[PDB]
From TrEMBL, chain A:
It is found in: Nucleus, Nucleolus. Residues 1-22 are annotated as: Disordered. Coiled coil: none annotated. The keyword Mitochondrion does not apply. Involved in the biogenesis of the 60S ribosomal subunit. Keywords: Nucleus, Ribonucleoprotein. GO terms for cellular component: nucleolus; ribonucleoprotein complex. Belongs to the NOP16 family. This is Nucleolar protein 16. It comes from the Eukaryota. The lineage of its organism: Eukaryota, Fungi, Dikarya, Ascomycota, Pezizomycotina.
UniProtKB/TrEMBL annotation, chain B:
Residues 1-15 are annotated as: Disordered. This is 60S ribosomal protein L4-like protein. Belongs to the universal ribosomal protein uL4 family. One of its GO terms (molecular function) is structural constituent of ribosome. Keywords: Ribonucleoprotein, Ribosomal protein. One of its GO terms (cellular component) is ribosome. It comes from Chaetomium thermophilum (strain DSM 1495 / CBS 144.50 / IMI 039719) (Thermochaetoides thermophila). The chain holds residues 54 to 313 of 365 of the full protein. GO terms for biological process: translation. The keyword Iron-sulfur does not apply.
TrEMBL record, chain C:
It comes from the Eukaryota. HAMAP family: Ribosomal_uL24_A. InterPro entries: KOW (IPR005824), Rib_uL2_dom2 (IPR014722), Ribosomal_uL24_euk/arc (IPR005756), Ribosomal_uL24_KOW (IPR041988), Translation_prot_SH3-like_sf (IPR008991). This is 60S ribosomal protein L26-like protein. GO terms for biological process: translation. GO terms for molecular function: RNA binding; structural constituent of ribosome. The keyword Cytoplasm does not apply. GO terms for cellular component: large ribosomal subunit. The lineage of its organism: Eukaryota, Fungi, Dikarya, Ascomycota, Pezizomycotina. It comes from Chaetomium thermophilum (strain DSM 1495 / CBS 144.50 / IMI 039719). Belongs to the universal ribosomal protein uL24 family. SUPFAM superfamilies: Translation proteins SH3-like domain. Residues 1-22 are annotated as: Disordered.
UniProtKB/TrEMBL annotation, chain D:
Belongs to the eukaryotic ribosomal protein eL13 family. It comes from the Eukaryota. The keyword Transport does not apply. GO terms for molecular function: RNA binding; structural constituent of ribosome. GO terms for biological process: translation. Keywords: Ribonucleoprotein, Ribosomal protein. This is 60S ribosomal protein L13. The chain holds residues 13 to 129 of 213 of the full protein. One of its GO terms (cellular component) is cytosolic large ribosomal subunit.
Length: 167, 260, 134, 117
RNA sequence: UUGACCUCGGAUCAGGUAGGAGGACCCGCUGAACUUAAGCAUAUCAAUAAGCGGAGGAAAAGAAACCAACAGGGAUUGCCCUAGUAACGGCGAGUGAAGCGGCAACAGCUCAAAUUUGAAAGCUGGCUUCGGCCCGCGUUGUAAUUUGGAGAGGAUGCUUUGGGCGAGGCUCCUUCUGAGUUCCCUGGAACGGGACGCCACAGAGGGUGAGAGCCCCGUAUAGUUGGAAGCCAAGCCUGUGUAAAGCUCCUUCGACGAGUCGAGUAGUUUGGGAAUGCUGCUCAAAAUGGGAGGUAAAUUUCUUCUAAAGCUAAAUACCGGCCAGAGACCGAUAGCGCACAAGUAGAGUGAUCGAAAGAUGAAAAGCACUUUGAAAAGAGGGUUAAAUAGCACGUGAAAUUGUUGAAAGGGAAGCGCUUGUGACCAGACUUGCGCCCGGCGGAUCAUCCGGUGUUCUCACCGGUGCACUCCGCCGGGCUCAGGCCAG
RNA sequence: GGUUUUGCGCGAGUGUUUGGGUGUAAAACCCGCACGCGUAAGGUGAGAGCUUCGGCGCAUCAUCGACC
RNA sequence: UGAGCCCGGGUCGAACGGCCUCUAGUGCAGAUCUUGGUGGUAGUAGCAAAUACUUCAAUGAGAACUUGAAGGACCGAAGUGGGGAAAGGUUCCAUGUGAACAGCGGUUGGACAUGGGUUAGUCGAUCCUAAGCCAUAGGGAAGUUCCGUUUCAAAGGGGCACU
RNA sequence: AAACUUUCAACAACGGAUCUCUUGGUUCUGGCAUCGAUGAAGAACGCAGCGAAAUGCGAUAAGUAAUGUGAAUUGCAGAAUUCCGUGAAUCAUCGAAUCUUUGAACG
């Protein structure tokens, strides 16, 4: 209170704070969503146009009429009606409509490069010395001590030779 | 403020002194010393029953009664006599439930204010528009100090269909004084019965009229109320053949000759 | 109707800002309209007043008195037009404070800064005129 | 029942509509960052414990490791593609396992997964 | 003799760090009484006020030694109900949760217990040519790997990849963007009244000599000029080392926190002697272990977790800080003590206590000059729309006082009813209506025809009707009705 | 927080406003799941009111009942 | 009927009222009520002791209490004297004013306004310790901080030497 | 008859009510997170041509540098500005400086 009275009495200017916000309220960039997002609509209204789902949970109230963004067995094992011990781990082997959704499906299905990994210069030399001395005997290469000092298995040596194209 | 009249040190002098038993400020070097305090009768004292923010400012009203009132407000808006009784200049407009073609209000046809003003003049809502314009004058009282400087009359209310008319007519009608715009799916009794008085002049669109059946068919737990009377014309009921055939003969006249 | 949340409609705050404005702000408030000949020449409606301008008073007791601006007294929101004066008791002449909103500029004091001011206002006016036109 | 000093602890909710706008803007902020993604995470279907409520189902915290493996979704990828994982819940019955496995396959049918980079 | 190590010291040694303020909200310690009820005492106020210590934009809590008894749930936090329920109390005054359930928000992790042992692989300095060098710390353990709904090691086969620029973009400031000063009247001054216009995604607000959308600042929407710092990012350069990572399988392994649980006791606390929790003291553990719960179900079967190490955003609080927007609030004895050079003047040794006090005028145009007075001032004269606005300054009530005008007064005045005198006044009235003659001035006389509107039989327009009919005036006569007091 | 009476809505149901969704944005409009409170047939005599003049008999009271 | 309502005349200058609903910090003769202002008492009580004052002239608009001179009285070195400590802070000097204060007046003043005035190697402080207090070593205390003052403190000085 | 006491009226006083106004308060809501040994909060003394207070600043002292704007400040006096310009201003912004004695206060 005394500080506030002092400021009103002082000749120093008032530091008007601009309305800056920690989190942005609209998408930005050069992607499909940012180029189709309408700033004056709501979250559900924008997603309904996109053909996507905004909330995967339970509906907690009444929505607008047009809203579409808020959602033999011998062994008798229930899982038999669900099928189509190791699975893929970095991707999923996944199998009239709005423009945004159709554009999104095209970006997800666009073929991309892989950037195949090569082998080091010394690794090729170690492999080449192996094929020079033992030919195509992976079992002999594994048992060699001078040329295979890390005692790698025949299966691992065979796999590396295939990647190098040395059979 | 909770501390108004309390941030002082006062104590009653006692009973044996020939002065009122009221707390008095201690000290001795000011005009304030020895003055009464802490009382609602005392200058610079605490007020009686200080106003508190917990006062029940808002009122809980049944949704059924809210929808009943809106239905009554809409029905009274179709009654021509009630429109005049509420101060609306309805004399040059036909078809009191005035329905304008949605083709003349959808798109940029009305987003220009000059175009929106022209449409109101053509349909017959004109004289109600400059009625608001000529009625503006300064408020009487301290409301001027507190941000309510002027007051004026209400004009026509435009009810549209946002999904057919396109929500762009709102900006056309925004600047015109008195003219208020309201979507069909969300009607306001504060806008339908101003001041508690029924009979507001409303100009509809063709799309809004079609949607008006759908909006009341979608309200859950609400049906259109059934009145307690079927015919509201008392003259027809009393002067009907059924009633008059079973009545007794009159026992007198409106004015009776006094005998003595 | 005001829409942006940063705008205020308070009478108390508007009167405080107007009467406690700095000198730079007061220059904008002390603007005067341009004459009809100047409007069709520069495509500019108004401009802040300054010392060199020539004005014609169009409101007040001085009906249609013309003269050159002599002082821009920003501290009391008044300007001093030459030969628009009143005599004190002693007979010494003192200027009469005229508000810029009561005058119209007939001749404009020209310098590189004010040609830049007129060009910027014209650029905006022609931008929207063609935007509204087509 | 005012034997204590209640007047100094009285909370008035005059910010009820203000907080709702703040909550709605926070939900919009999440959609701004996660533009194509939903603002929530997929949660399983669970049964309420008590005999009073055991005839009704609701949403749980996250999916069990067993029912995540039966669906065909790796553990370390599930929190990354918008699936909540709960390592504390056990199945204990085929009925809970089947219901949540089917829920996951329905989620996989509707999914659009973009290339990594 | 010399030299290590350990421990402890010096230095204005090289580089750092803490204290104080603020304390609205937050984390702890400590800690009352007035009051309420009851023979008394416990209880209640209250696990509050005062006092002390410690943080932030939030803090705290937090990923079960949990809830449950279920067809199960699944870190923490908050709202709603649960619920004035359970439970504790002379079952007084009273006190008083929690699980489930609907919702807001959601996020998971790091160590200690292992040997890198085929290579301390780790890090603080300070000298630099910024290439790199030495001094040390440390094996009484710094890296990588693992953290018990796990994991390791091998084998096997798929799958996965790291750095540097970066156009441009978002956020925030910043420049510019509509229309009457047209004519008349009142007025000192139009921003008032009348007329004719214009703009409006702008008729919010303010100023300008009196109520201004168009006189001015701004107001609305889209753009547009320049800048700031964060974050994102199309693309472009590169990458590498037999380097890392996810899983699968198994004739191999799988370390999990002690003066801590617990028993006894004292104080305090809770709805909670299975002690609800905490603290002090005495004693002092375990490994198919330990904790909690369910259960008469025949023995203590069954269920559910893993304590004594640690980190973590969000939903939540906010009388304080930087701002911003509002009100059916108050309007100078009100509203904060303070609308003013107010925590000021002033009082007290001190801790502390603590006021009163806004308004000339649109513009000082704040009265030149003359005269009387020692002066203060007065009178002329003047400014102004106004001095019946002269800084003892908007408007200027009452108490109280002066002058003038009228009246009354042999020890109260004032009050009720009724005349009279004197002064002073509001009404009422001024003529209307209708007949009979005369002079007129004009065709909305009756009827008929056509069109139109309606209440479908009533009207209105146009024509015919160019005068014993109809309408207004004037000059006479008469009737009626007209104010006050009376016979 | 209880309680009595009057008006209003719906009525074996009632209560949108913890919250969510729109909005011209503290207004107004809408409602998915729980939740609070309440709920899941006789004889005789009088008796308002009907009557086809024969009788039919509301509510409520008295009595004999029936059931839990 | 009444609480009240309306109009006329005067003053004034910038906003206000009727109708119907909504709302409340909504109606005063009292509370030895609060704040402010104003009366009768009343031109009344009263304006004390320190024996004591008088004449001419000057200043000044104005002189019992301002000055010069003269007279009559007084303090009587334990003073009604001349200086300090403590305390006060410009009251000290000159010029000017007379709104307020000096319970009459004032031309006078410790009043008001405008200027001026305090000169040190030797006078005091500055240095020393006294009764006594504080820090450090340590030890209590939840803590703000308390004890402790030479204590089971590595606590302070100085010298010499063909290097 | 006057004087005195009382009543009313007009004018004039005393006093500051009433009406009107308000760069103030009070309450609610929203965005944001920023004191200090690089010396804070508080206290003191200086600084303007003419200033006591309030305000601003610190011996560079009602202020310096930089950026923007674009022609003032004003109570008086004195300088300006060439205006076709690194440039007035008790202007705004603000990233660089100066920053007396103390005060956690540190020879």
């Amino acid at each position: 209170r005394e500080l506030q009275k002092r400021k009103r009495r002082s000749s120093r200017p008032t530091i008007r704070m601009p309305n800056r916000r920690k989190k942005a309220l609209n998408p930005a960039g050069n992607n499909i969503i940012a180029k189709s997002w309408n700033k004056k609509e709501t979250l559900s209204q924008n997603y309904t146009r996109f053909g996507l789902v905004a909330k995967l949970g339970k509906a907690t109230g009444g929505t607008a009429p047009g809203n579409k963004a808020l959602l033999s067995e011998s062994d008798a094992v229930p899982q038999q009606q669900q099928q189509e011990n190791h699975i893929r781990q970095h991707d999923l082997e996944l199998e009239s409509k709005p423009e945004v959704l159709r554009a999104l499906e095209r970006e997800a299905t666009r073929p991309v490069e892989k950037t195949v990994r090569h082998q080091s210069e010394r690794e090729r030399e170690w492999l080449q010395r192996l094929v020079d001395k033992h030919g195509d005997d992976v079992a002999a290469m594994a048992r060699d001590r001078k040329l295979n000092p890390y005692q790698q298995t025949a299966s691992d040596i065979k796999r590396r030779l295939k990647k190098a194209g040395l059979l | 403020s909770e501390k108004a009249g309390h941030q002082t040190s006062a104590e009653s002098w006692g009973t044996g002194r020939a002065v009122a038993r009221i707390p008095r400020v201690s000290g001795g070097g000011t005009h304030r010393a020895g003055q009464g305090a802490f009382g609602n009768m005392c200058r610079s004292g605490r007020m009686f029953a200080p106003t508190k923010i917990w006062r029940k400012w808002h009122v809980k009203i049944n949704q059924g009664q809210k929808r009943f009132a809106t239905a009554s407000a809409l029905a009274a808006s179709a009654v021509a006599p009630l429109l005049m009784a509420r101060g609306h200049q309805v004399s040059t407009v036909p078809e009191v439930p005035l329905v304008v073609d949605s083709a003349a209000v959808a798109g940029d046809a009305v987003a220009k204010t000059a175009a929106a003003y022209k449409l109101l003049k053509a349909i017959g809502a004109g004289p109600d528009v400059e009625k608001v314009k000529k009625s503006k004058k300064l408020r009487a009282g301290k409301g001027k100090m507190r941000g309510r400087r002027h007051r004026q009359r209400r004009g026509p209310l435009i009810v549209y269909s946002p999904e057919h008319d396109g929500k762009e007519l709102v900006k056309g009608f925004r600047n015109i004084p008195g003219v208020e715009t309201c979507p069909v799916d969300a009607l306001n009794l504060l806008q339908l019965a101003p001041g508690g008085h029924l009979g507001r002049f409303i100009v509809w669109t063709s799309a809004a009229i079609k949607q008006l059946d759908a909006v009341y068919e979608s309200k859950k737990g609400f049906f259109l109320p059934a009145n307690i009377v079927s015919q509201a014309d008392l003259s027809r009921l009393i002067n009907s053949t059924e009633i008059q055939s079973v009545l007794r003969a009159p026992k007198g006249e409106a004015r009776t000759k006094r005998a003595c | 109707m005001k829409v942006r949340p940063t705008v205020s409609s308070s009478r108390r705050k508007a009167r405080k800002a107007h009467f406690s404005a700095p000198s730079s702000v007061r220059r904008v408030i002390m603007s005067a309209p341009l004459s009809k000949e100047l409007r069709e020449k520069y495509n500019v409606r108004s401009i802040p007043i300054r010392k060199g301008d020539e004005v014609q008073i169009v409101r007040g007791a001085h009906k249609d008195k013309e003269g050159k601006v002599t002082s821009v007294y920003r501290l009391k929101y008044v300007i001093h037009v030459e030969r628009v004066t009143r005599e004190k008791a002693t007979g010494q002449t003192v200027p009469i404070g005229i508000h810029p909103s009561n005058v119209v500029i007939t001749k404009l004091h020209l310098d590189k800064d004010r040609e830049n001011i007129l060009a910027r206002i014209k650029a905006g006016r022609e931008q929207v005129a063609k935007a509204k036109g087509k | 029942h005012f034997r204590k000093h209640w007047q100094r602890r009285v909370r008035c909710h005059f910010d009820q509509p203000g907080k709702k706008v703040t909550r709605r803007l926070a939900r919009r902020a999440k959609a701004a960052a996660l533009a194509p993604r939903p603002v929530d995470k997929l949660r399983p279907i669970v049964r309420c414990p008590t005999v009073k409520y055991n005839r009704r189902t609701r949403l749980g915290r996250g999916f069990t490791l067993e029912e995540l493996k039966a669906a065909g979704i790796p553990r370390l990828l599930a929190p990354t593609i918008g699936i909540a994982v709960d390592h504390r819940r056990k199945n204990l019955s085929e009925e809970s396992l089947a219901a949540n496995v089917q829920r996951l396959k329905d989620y996989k049918a509707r999914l659009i997964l973009f290339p990594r980079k």
